[PDB]
Amino acid sequence: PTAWPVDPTTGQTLINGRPVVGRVFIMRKTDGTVKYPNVADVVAHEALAPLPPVVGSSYQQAPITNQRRMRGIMIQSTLWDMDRKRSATRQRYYPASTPANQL
Amino acid sequence: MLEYQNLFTRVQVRTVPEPGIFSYLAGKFGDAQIGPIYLGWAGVLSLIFGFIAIEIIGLNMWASVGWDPVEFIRQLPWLALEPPPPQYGLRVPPLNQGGWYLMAGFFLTVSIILWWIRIYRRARALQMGSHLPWAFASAIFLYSTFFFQPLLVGSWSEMVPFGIFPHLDWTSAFSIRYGNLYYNPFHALSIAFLYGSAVLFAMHGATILAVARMGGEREIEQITDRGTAAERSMLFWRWCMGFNATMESIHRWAWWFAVLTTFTGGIGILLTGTVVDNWYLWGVKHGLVAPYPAQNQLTPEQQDLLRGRYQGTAPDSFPSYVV
Amino acid sequence: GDAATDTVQVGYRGTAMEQNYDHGDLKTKFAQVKLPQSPPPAGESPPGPLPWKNVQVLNDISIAEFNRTMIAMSTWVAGTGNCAYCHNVAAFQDDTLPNGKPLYTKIVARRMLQMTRNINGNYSQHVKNTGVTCYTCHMGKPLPNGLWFYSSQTDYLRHYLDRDGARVITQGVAPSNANRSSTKQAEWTYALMISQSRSLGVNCTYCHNTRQFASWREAPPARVTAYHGILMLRDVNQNYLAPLQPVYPAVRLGAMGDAPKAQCVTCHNGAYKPLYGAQMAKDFPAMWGRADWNGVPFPGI
Amino acid sequence: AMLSFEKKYRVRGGTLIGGDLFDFWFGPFYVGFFGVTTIFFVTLGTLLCVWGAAMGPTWNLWQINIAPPDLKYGLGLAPLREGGLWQIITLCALGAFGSWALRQAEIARKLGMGMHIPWAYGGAILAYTTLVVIRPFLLGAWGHGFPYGIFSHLDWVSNVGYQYLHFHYNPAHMIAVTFFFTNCLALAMHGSLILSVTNPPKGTPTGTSEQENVFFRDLLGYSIGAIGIHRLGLFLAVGAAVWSAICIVISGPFWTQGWPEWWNWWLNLPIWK
Amino acid sequence: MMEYIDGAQIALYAFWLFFFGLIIYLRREDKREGYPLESPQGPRDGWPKGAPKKTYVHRDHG
Amino acid sequence: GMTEEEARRFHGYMVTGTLGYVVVASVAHFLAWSWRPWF
Amino acid sequence: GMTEEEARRFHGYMVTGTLGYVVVASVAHFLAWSWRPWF
Amino acid sequence: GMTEEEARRFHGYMVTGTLGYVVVASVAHFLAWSWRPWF
Amino acid sequence: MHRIWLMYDPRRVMVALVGFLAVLALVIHFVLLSSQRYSWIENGTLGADQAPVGASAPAAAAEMSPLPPGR
Amino acid sequence: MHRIWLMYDPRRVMVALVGFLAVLALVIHFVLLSSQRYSWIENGTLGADQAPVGASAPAA
Amino acid sequence: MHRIWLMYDPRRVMVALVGFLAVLALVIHFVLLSSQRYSWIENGTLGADQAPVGASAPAA
Ligand SMILES: CCCCCCCCCCCCCC(=O)OC[C@H](COP(=O)(O)OCC(O)COP(=O)(O)OC[C@@H](COC(=O)CCCCCCCCCCCCC)OC(=O)CCCCCCCCCCCCC)OC(=O)CCCCCCCCCCCCC
Ligand code: BCL
Ligand SMILES: CC[C@H]1c2cc3[nH]c4c(c3C)C(=O)[C@H](C(=O)OC)c4c3nc(cc4[nH]c(cc(n2)[C@@H]1C)c(C(C)=O)c4C)[C@@H](C)[C@@H]3CCC(=O)OC/C=C(\C)CCC[C@H](C)CCC[C@H](C)CCCC(C)C
Ligand SMILES: CC[C@H]1c2cc3[nH]c4c(c3C)C(=O)[C@H](C(=O)OC)c4c3nc(cc4[nH]c(cc(n2)[C@@H]1C)c(C(C)=O)c4C)[C@@H](C)[C@@H]3CCC(=O)OC/C=C(\C)CCC[C@H](C)CCC[C@H](C)CCCC(C)C
Ligand SMILES: *[C@H]1O[C@H](CO)[C@@H](O[C@@H]2O[C@@H](C)[C@H](O)[C@@H](O)[C@H]2O)[C@H](O)[C@@H]1O[C@H]1O[C@H](C(=O)O)[C@@H](O[C@H]2O[C@H](CO)[C@@H](O)[C@H](O)[C@H]2NC(C)=O)[C@H](OC(C)=O)[C@H]1OC(C)=O
Ligand SMILES: *[C@H]1O[C@H](CO)[C@@H](O[C@@H]2O[C@@H](C)[C@H](O)[C@@H](O)[C@H]2O)[C@H](O)[C@@H]1O[C@H]1O[C@H](C(=O)O)[C@@H](O[C@H]2O[C@H](CO)[C@@H](O)[C@H](O)[C@H]2NC(C)=O)[C@H](OC(C)=O)[C@H]1OC(C)=O
Ligand SMILES: CC(C)=CCC/C(C)=C/CC/C(C)=C/CC/C(C)=C/CC/C(C)=C/CC/C(C)=C/CC/C(C)=C/CC/C(C)=C/CC1=C(C)C(=O)c2ccccc2C1=O
Ligand SMILES: COC(C)(C)C/C=C/C(C)=C/C=C/C(C=O)=C/C=C/C(C)=C/C=C/C=C(C)/C=C/C=C(\C)CC/C=C(C)/C=C/C=C(\C)C(=O)O
Ligand SMILES: COC(C)(C)C/C=C/C(C)=C/C=C/C(C=O)=C/C=C/C(C)=C/C=C/C=C(C)/C=C/C=C(\C)CC/C=C(C)/C=C/C=C(\C)C(=O)O
Ligand SMILES: COC(C)(C)C/C=C/C(C)=C/C=C/C(C)=C/C=C/C(C)=C/C=C\C=C(C)\C=C\C=C(C)\C=C\C=C(C)\C=C\CC(C)(C)OC
Ligand SMILES: [Fe+3]
């Protein structure tokens, strides 16, 4: 299954019951690559499908001081990960806001 | 920079009165006015709608840095006016959560269409073929798919954000979401025409400059009354690569390669997420994907453990773990 | 030769799955670890019944190994010989000052021992035989790097606390109801993945073949380790760090009053392994959650 | 076969090498010494690509993949079955592309044309040489080249981009993209203008340089002129490839972090640090 | 219910049939000058055959 | 061009203005050194 | 154009210019050496 | 373009300038060798 | 040695020399300012024995590597 | 030495000179302002023995 | 041997030679400055016996 039989007399490989002169190797294409058969075979090597999302049943607003002014989705990684200017940091969130009654 | 024709090195000339029988005419080619930059009714309306679109975009960007004019300049390429949240689908969203976005998108789209009307009317008035308006229509086709593809998948959240770096974040994330856009065959075609447009204009620009000292740049005369400059251009390419265009037909090759860039582009976008959700897997199906040796192998236990979960909603609370 | 770039291939030869390092910058970072890396006290273990009055975690190691551990803990968290950082030094058994105010640092450190055992014991699929000790996060200082607090709802670091699920790619050709992920959700995953790349000082090809980010077969094995790192951080944050909120002084807490939480960079500090793979935990059986470390059995009284 | 005006132009002279020996035509093609060397390199390089496909896993055109060597071979020739064949094909490709440009110079000289076309093509050769010679040399291994395969080289482009986390943020790449996009716009405008004067609506006189000048001025607000639009096209198209070569050669040899964090210098200007 | 055939593949061959039609059209336009070719054993048209040489109507000024 | 007489006249101002500027820069370095020496 | 007398008179200023510059640079080096030797 | 006598005069400076440079460079190598030999 | 001033125009040589010396001076200053031993703006007040010196040998531990494993 | 003003046009020379010195002055100030030792807008009131100093060699 | 200067213009050759020598000198200095053993700005004050040396044959 992994190698052909070897004649005990001569250390010589037997292919279909008859000796080969030389050192036998199992032929393969470049680096053992093999053409992908189909999508199903590719998918059968992967993890199973992801589970359904966990979605919140209702939305509670955060306090306004926890709401971002910038709606851009990557901004935390693309800018704020390197920008630490104090004034610019303060501008990232809405300031506190209170009904005049409560002051 | 220095140049390989004398023509405007030195002894450039002033028509002190107007040309058209530096300076400019005040008259008509037929009924078309020749002096000012042409607008007409459609041009004027296009500028008003487009101004308000740009003004809405800028004011939202500026509000997002808390009106700080220093941060408005400092952070400008990261600022955006952003599409609505996904949960709204095609419904009208809140004003600060994509309502201004759809408004700017509407005014920009009308402004673009009115600018096409302007160009179409001006081409007719100058008694010219409509080649340029249909070229511009191919660009408008690609642009419009950034409305129609979000429509066909059912959410305005999928639209392109207005913003320099943010629209490039969207461009990357779109390819990530739909399983690598390199395996979209209409994207591959659109690149082939995009590269071919640079090939052709390099070849054609160099060709005409190589015969400019024989009047090759006077292409309308060379088309109607072929000179030696046209003949030498045809023979260079025939001797180089075995076949050649004409002075007229090279401009058709130029026209189609540019036009087909955005036309094939638009089809590839419309197909994405409507017909194919994973282009790499479509590539596997149709035999596009080269095989590589496996970099890792999963056990059956890992295949269930490493299944993820699709991404859901953010947490809308700040949990205490006091216990 | 110093502006030169070192590169590591991590995938098949034509794929450009490669890591690039500035040579000079890397040897600077490496030296800044390899010199400060602290020398352990030599091993010992004599017999004797445990004299301790208020030992709740370490009651399974010999008296010399215990004292050896305290010398290490002071060195790793507080500077060597600084037992006063945690203790009423006249009464090591006490968990309060003479004033009756609690020795919050000792109460935290007791939980940090349990956390370190839980990491080394239950998350070997992440830390393997390198393991962690107090030095991995603290590096000689009371505050680790990468501390984070509540802010926005959409803050991606909450992937390491209460959220679950980052996947956005469809495992099929045609669209379906199974995956309705937005392009905004792909932007959120992309932001998260840049953070992980920076936390290790690697690029995306360290864990992916970017022709298909979803693929595990085409990805290096490191992607599997990375996934266990997410699961580990969720346990660490939910069960150990976040519930320490009432123990801390208010100066240590976030604007929301939440306890500080950890992330990948807290251990990794910008390196592909913490401390470039320095193997300390093998020297400190007090901190194994395991009956043996790489075949070396636990001293076990 | 010859164009009905051609024979008159088929003189000797203009060759850079080889005198009269190779100064002849084969059908439409001019040969010349660099014609001979072109066909040598094209044939050898093609047949080695066919051999690379034969010893690879499949004959499917899209999937054929002749990969470079592992990085561990550095600047040496790998075993042929392990990327050495990619190196020989690369030497063939360089020989072919160089010969093609020098053959174009002989053709242009024979017609009394300027050298603009060889030099424009030099911009494409520069970008190729940057991808497979200069950048791999500065990185110290030929294995940094891209594989020769219709889709497998797109996997290389993808992975090289994400080696810098977010390659869109590469500043030279933004310039190169802007040239490619502006070139395509300029090509559409110039093509449309020439066609629309030479092909007016039926029953309308053929247009004039004045009409295209007027319309172009309505489009851009200034008059480029006939020589200027061809200068602009050449500048945009060649400039795109030059800025492409810059953007890749800085990625790795010079900048090794993510491209987004390159922009930290802009955030830290002293007027607003 | 077709497994292999899908809308993107259908679209792509629709484009290929258009595109090769366009290349035929463009090569006919390329041949309005300098064709038929001259050779021994007489004139040659190539393929496709070229469209006829084109006369252009000048504007009058009298 | 310029005469040798005008060149010599200009040179007189030019050398004077140079040396004057270098004298003021000298006092500036005297003050900077007094406040925070760099060696 | 430049004459042989012009060259001769120019060379004088050119050599004192170079020599003065080398004198200043060598004093600058010996200050640097006294502050922080590189060998 | 040089005459015979012009070329022959120039060749004198060119030889001596070359040899003078090599002599200076040989002292530089002597110093460098005495500081840190490379074999 | 004046004949060089007939062999080349003094204006072009004078400009070329000054351009060269200015470029060289800037290069050497910035190479030093970038170094550890000669970053004189931050550390110029340190005595000659206190200034940084490059290692006679870098340090190592066998289990540690600056680069990740692979290929 | 004044003959140099026949070799070169004073009006161009002096415009180039002012431009050069302005650039050099701005470069040196911003290089200092960027340092720790001479970040004088923030730390200018510190005493000379109290202002930052870059890292030494170790005692070894 | 001087008739070489009839084949080549010395005004060319001088500029060519100085251009070559300046480039060659800068290459060698930067090659040495990039090395470990001869990184003389940082390590120039080490004695010859203390300077770095590349790896030997290890037999291991
Ligand atoms: C993807 C988006 C971007 C993709 C971008 C794609 C751009 C494509 C641009 C290239 C297309 C034009 C090429 C061309 O016209 O060459 C001249 C030649 C001959 O005709 P002629 O020039 O008018 O006449 C001369 C000839 O009659 C007598 O000449 P002579 O006696 O001196 O010399 C001998 C003959 C022998 O013929 C040949 O050797 C040529 C045979 C191979 C032609 C293949 C053309 C490419 C087909 C591409 C379409 C598809 C084929 C499957 O003539 C010659 O020596 C002429 C040598 C011409 C060499 C041209 C080589 C071009 C290779 C292009 C490779 C393109 C790769 C993409 O023409 C032909 O042989 C016919 C070509 C007709 C255009 C292809 C249309 C295909 C439509 C679909 C199938 C139609 C079935 C009927
Ligand atoms: C990680 C990133 C992804 C990726 C994601 C995408 C996405 C997403 C898209 C493309 C698209 C394109 N990509 Mg791709 N792309 C990648 C890699 C590449 C590579 C490469 C070497 O790797 C190349 C060469 C390309 C090339 C191309 C082009 C062929 C194509 C755009 C055509 C065009 O002209 O657009 C430029 C032209 C326009 C946008 C038309 C605009 C016309 C309108 C009318 C202008 C209005 C202006 C208005 C009046 C004023 C504005 C005012 C302001 C609003 C203030 N991509 C990878 C795989 N690419 C597009 C496409 O067609 O896909 C099929 C597309 O949508
Ligand atoms: C074939 C595909 C290529 C293509 C082609 C193309 N584009 C075109 C055309 C063509 C053939 C045109 O004719 C058309 C054009 O006009 O060109 C000059 C156009 C055009 N391509 C454009 C852009 C563009 N094309 C792009 C790409 C492409 N264009 C493709 C590569 C891109 C990219 C790559 O992203 C861009 C950004 C525009 C320059 C132009 C269309 C202009 C337009 O529609 O403008 C609408 C108006 C506005 C946005 C408003 C402006 C507002 C002012 C700034 C305010 C000033 C105040 C105002 C005066 C107040 C009002 C007062 C009133 C009383 C007046
Ligand atoms: C100035 C920059 C732009 C440019 C311009 C340009 N290209 C040009 C010219 C000009 C001015 C020519 O004159 C020249 C020409 O003759 O065109 C007809 C050419 C040309 N541009 C070409 C292609 C081309 N240009 C490209 C790009 C560009 N061309 C730039 C955008 C691209 C891209 C981006 O992908 C391609 C594919 C050819 C059609 C032609 C050059 C023909 C030539 O050199 O022929 C001799 C060689 C062969 C016929 C075959 C060689 C085979 C090799 C020995 C083996 C294969 C090795 C190869 C690396 C394998 C790659 C496999 C891929 C899947 C990766
Ligand atoms: C605050 O509440 C939000 C909204 O539930 C929580 O976010 C959830 O979990 C995330 C994974 C996900 O991103 C998000 O979509 C959402 O599904 C957030 O984590 C905080 O959680 C705590 O409060 C929860 C709450 O909703 O009140 C609470 O949930 C449980 O209790 C409520 C009230 O009885 C009940 O309505 C929920 O169905 C119930 N859910 C579960 C799964 O038990 C959380 O308690 C638990 C055990 O989950 C709180 O979590 C903690 C650690 O305190
Ligand atoms: C801090 O406070 C705790 C309180 O629990 C003390 O813990 C005691 O001693 C431990 C050995 C034992 O394990 C534990 O169960 C408990 O018995 C801890 O030793 C520290 O003690 C100091 O502060 C104490 C405090 O709570 O204020 C104080 O205790 C005494 O005074 C308070 C009132 O102020 C009274 O409530 C306590 O009952 C009382 N306890 C005793 C035993 O008298 C300690 O004072 C004394 C004398 O013990 C403080 O200890 C010292 C040496 O100052
Ligand atoms: C390998 C082999 C089989 C060898 C056999 C032996 C032989 C044939 C020997 C003969 C000698 C030699 C050297 C032969 C060369 C053989 C080879 C390698 C041929 C390949 C030729 C080749 C590069 C083909 C590619 C064609 C392509 C796809 C080109 C891309 C660009 C493109 C779309 C061009 C079409 C538009 C055209 C025709 C542009 C040229 C063109 C331009 C640009 C103008 O500006 C212009 C202005 C005014 C009038 C005319 C023109 C004009 O024709
Ligand atoms: C850490 O930082 C890094 C950067 C790393 C460290 C390194 C730094 C380096 C390398 C520095 C190099 C410095 C340098 C090198 O050259 C510096 C050289 C400086 C020089 C030469 C300055 C010269 C100034 C001269 C002036 C101002 C002249 C003014 C003249 C005036 C006012 C009078 C004009 C005439 C008048 C008015 C009358 C006209 C006549 C009339 C009208 C008539 O006659 O009619
Ligand atoms: C670690 O770093 C790396 C970089 C790696 C290490 C390596 C570095 C390397 C390789 C360095 C090489 C250095 C080098 C090599 O040659 C250096 C050579 C330097 C030289 C040649 C300096 C020469 C200076 C000469 C000067 C300044 C002359 C001034 C003249 C003046 C002022 C007079 C002007 C005229 C007047 C006033 C009037 C004229 C009369 C007139 C008009 C009349 O009378 O009409
Ligand atoms: C005071 O004035 C100030 C200073 C504010 C002026 C300055 C303004 C500035 C600085 C502006 C800066 C603008 C920038 C930098 C803009 C960048 C824009 C970019 C890069 C945009 C890129 C892509 C955008 C795309 C593709 C957007 C597409 C949107 C579409 C197609 C939307 C269509 C919407 C439609 C058709 C309709 C919507 C309405 C509904 C849904 C209701 O249908 C009827
Ligand atoms: Fe043209």
Radius of gyration (C-alpha) of chain C in whole angstroms: 22
Alpha helices in chain J (DSSP H): 4-7, 10-34, 40-43
Ligand 2 atom at minimal distance to the Cα of residue B170: 8
How many Å lie between the centroid of ligand 8 and the Cα of residue G30?
26
Name the residue with tokens 């037909």. B249
- What would the two tokens of residue A28 be? 């393969």
The ligand 1 site (C-beta within 6 Å) comprises B 192, 196, 242-243; D 1, 27-28; E 20, 23-24, 27, 44, 46-47
Say if the Cβ atoms of B308 and A50 lie within 8 Å.
Answer: yes
Ligand 6 binding pocket includes C54 (Cβ within 6 Å): yes
CB-based contact, J52 to chain I, within 8 Å: yes
Which residues in chain K have their CB less than 8 angstroms from residue I52's CB?
42
The 3-state DSSP class for residue D268 equals coil
Q: Which residues pair with A13 in a beta bridge?
A: A6
Distance, CA of K18 to CA of A79 (rounded, Å): 48
Q: Using CA atoms in the order C194, C200, C206, C210, what is the torsion angle rounded to 10 degrees?
A: 0
- Decide if D107 contacts D121 (C-beta within 8 A): no
* Helix and strand counts by DSSP (H, E) for chain I: 3, 0
A78 φ, ψ to 5°? Answer: -80, -25
Q: How far is B284 from chain A (nearest CA, A)?
A: 6
Q: Residue H20 has which token pair?
A: 């003078």
Q: Which two tokens stand for residue F5?
A: 């007489």
Output b/e per residue, F20-31; b: 16+ Cβ within 10 A.
eeeeeeeeeeee
J2 is in an annotated binding site: no
Distance CA C17, CA C120 (A): 31
Distances in Å between the Cα of C217 and the Cα atoms of B202, D151, F13 are 43, 19, 79
In this complex, the residue of C19, C31, C37 whose CB is nearest that of residue I58 is C31
Contacting partners of chain E (3+ CB pairs under 8 A)? B, D
Quote the CA–CA distance of B138 and D192 in Å, as a whole number: 13
Note the ligand closest to the C-alpha atom of I24: 9
Grouping H, G, I as helix, E, B as strand and the rest as coil, residue C6 is strand
Between CA D125 and CA D134, with CA D131 as vertex, the angle to 5 degrees is 90
Q: Cα Rg for chain B, rounded, in angstroms?
A: 27
Contact B60 CB / ligand 2 (< 6 Å): no
User: What is the spatial distance between Cα B177 and Cα C169, in angstroms, rounded to a whole number?
Assistant: 6
Q: Mind spelling out the 3-state secondary structure of D78-102? A: CCHHHCHHHHHHHHHHHHHHHHHHH
Range K21-53 burial, b when 16+ CB lie within 10 A, else e: eeeeeeeeeeeeeeebebbbebbbbbeeeebbe
Q: Which of C281, C283, C249 is nearest to C117 (CA)?
A: C281
Contact I41, J37 (CB under 8 A): yes
Nearest CB to D57; choose among A33, A83, A85: A33
Contacts of I64 in chain C (CB under 8 A): 30, 33-34, 275-278
Name the structure determination technique: cryo-EM
C171 neighbors A42 (Cβ within 8 angstroms): no
Which residue type does D243 have? Answer: W
Cα(D148) to ligand 10 centroid in Å equals: 41
Breaks (C-N over 2.5 A) in chain B follow: 21
Nearest one of A47, B310, B88 to C185, comparing CA atoms:
B310
Mutate to test the pocket of ligand 4, among D38, D121, D129, D154 (most ligand atoms within 8 A of CB): D121
Structure tokens at H38: 């490379």
Selection from B210, B252, B254 nearest residue D186 by Cα: B254
Q: What's the burial of B82, exposed, middle or buried (CB within 10 Å: 0-12/13-18/19+)?
A: buried
Beta bridge partners of D30: D25
Output the CA–CA distances (angstroms, integers) from residue A100 to A61, A93, A103, C67, I33, in the order listed. Answer: 21, 21, 6, 61, 57
The beta-carbon neighbor of B293 closest among A33, A69, A70 is: A33
Inter-residue contact B238 to D28 (CB < 8 Å): yes
Note which residues in 15-44 of chain J have CB less than 8 A from chain D.
30, 33-34
| Rounded Cα–Cα distance for residues D116 and D101 (Å) | 11
- Take atom 36 of ligand 8 and give the residue whose Cα is closest: F13
| Contact predicate B39/B94, CB 8 Å | no
Q: G33 labelled as ligand-binding?
A: no
Amino acid at A50: P
Residue of the CA atom closest to atom 5 of ligand 3: D185
D 111-170 near B (Cβ less than 8 A): 111-117, 119-121, 123-124, 149, 151-152, 154-155, 157-158, 166, 168-169
Give chain G positions within 8 Å (CB) of K40. 38-39
* Ligand 10 center–CA B106 separation, angstroms: 8
Angle at CA B224, nearest 5°, toward B221 and B229? 55
**Distance (Å, whole) CA A42 – CA B294:** 11
Resolution of the experimental model in angstroms, please? Answer: 2.3
d(CA F33, CA H1): 59
Of the candidates C14, C198, C211, the beta carbon closest to that of D158 is on: C211
Q: How far is J46 from chain D (nearest CA, A)?
A: 21
DSSP H/E element including A12? strand A12-15
The answer on whether H33 is annotated among ligand-binding residues is no
Instruction: Give the nearest chain D residue to A27 (CA atoms).
Output: D55
